[PDB]
């Protein structure tokens, strides 16, 4: 209901409640391929930023899996974007980059974790968000871990439900 702060207009295409369709696709050189369901809620309350919650679930049992939440800020009147996330693995990250048209490309510069986080530890993350020609939201996530160089981990497209 609050009018949207002009600072976040360059990312207005991300706003909504979204559901992975088809299921998200998970991979890594060390992992068997997997699928997952994900609910994405991207919202705002009038501040110069977006609020997000991304919650994934097992496609069959619907048991909760990865979860994260945070904020997406922009430098006013620019296309420069900064993303902060806390993840249920006990990991936090700061990613920055830019939006051009309806594509956002960001990369981590800072990652920290809890002392008992499960190994292997992630060292670098990059994400690409885009709105495709059908009006669906796409996210692709890549990462490097202590033992694996930068490569794709996740790809998902979402249907807006709300
Ligand atoms: C930016 C967000 C994420 C990061 C940084 C991240 C990081 C990682 C890392 C470091 C690993 C271990 C890699 C290895 O075993 O070599 C992993 C594994 C895994 N992740 Fe992700 N992850 C993310 C998002 C997700 C999401 C959304 C899902 C959806 C369910 C997911 C599901 C899994 C699964 C199933 C595994 C392997 C579990 C196993 O070892 O059996 N992750 N992730």
UniProtKB/Swiss-Prot annotation:
Q: Which residues form a coiled coil?
A: none
Q: Which cysteines are joined by disulfide bonds?
A: none
Please, which domain of life does this record's source organism belong to? Eukaryota
* Residues reported in the UniProt entry to bind heme b: 30, 153
Q: Which region ranges are annotated with the description Nitrobindin?
A: 1-162
Where does the record say this protein resides? Cytoplasm; Nucleus
The UniProt comment on domains reads: The C-terminal nitrobindin region coordinates a heme and bears the isomerase activity. The N-terminal zinc finger domain likely binds DNA and may be involved in transcriptional regulation.
Which family, according to UniProt? In the C-terminal section; belongs to the nitrobindin family.
Quaternary structure and interacting proteins, as annotated: Homodimer.
Q: Say what the protein does.
A: Heme-binding protein able to scavenge peroxynitrite and to protect free L-tyrosine against peroxynitrite-mediated nitration, by acting as a peroxynitrite isomerase that converts peroxynitrite to nitrate. Therefore, this protein likely plays a role in peroxynitrite sensing and in the detoxification of reactive nitrogen and oxygen species (RNS and ROS, respectively). Is able to bind nitric oxide (NO) in vitro, but may act as a sensor of peroxynitrite levels in vivo, possibly modulating the transcriptional activity residing in the N-terminal region.
The entry's protein name is Peroxynitrite isomerase THAP4
**Protein's organism:** Homo sapiens (Human)
Q: What is the lineage of its organism?
A: Eukaryota, Metazoa, Chordata, Craniata, Vertebrata
């Amino acid at each position: 209901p609050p009018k949207m702060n002009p600072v976040v207009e360059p990312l207005s295409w991300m706003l909504g409640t979204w559901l992975s369709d088809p299921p998200g696709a998970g991979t890594y050189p060390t992992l068997q391929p997997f699928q997952y369901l994900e609910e994405v809620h991207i919202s705002h309350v009038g501040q110069p930023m977006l609020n997000f919650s991304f919650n994934s679930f097992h496609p069959d049992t619907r048991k909760p899996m990865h979860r994260e939440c945070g904020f997406i800020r922009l430098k006013p009147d620019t296309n420069k974007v900064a993303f902060v996330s806390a993840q249920n693995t006990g990991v936090v990250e700061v990613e920055e980059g830019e939006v051009n048209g309806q594509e956002l490309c960001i990369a981590s510069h800072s990652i920290a974790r809890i002392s008992f986080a499960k190994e292997p530890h992630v060292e670098q993350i990059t994400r690409k968000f885009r709105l495709n020609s059908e009006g669906k939201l796409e996210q692709t996530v890549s990462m490097a871990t202590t033992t694996q160089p930068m490569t794709q981990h996740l790809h998902v497209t979402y249907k807006k439900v709300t």
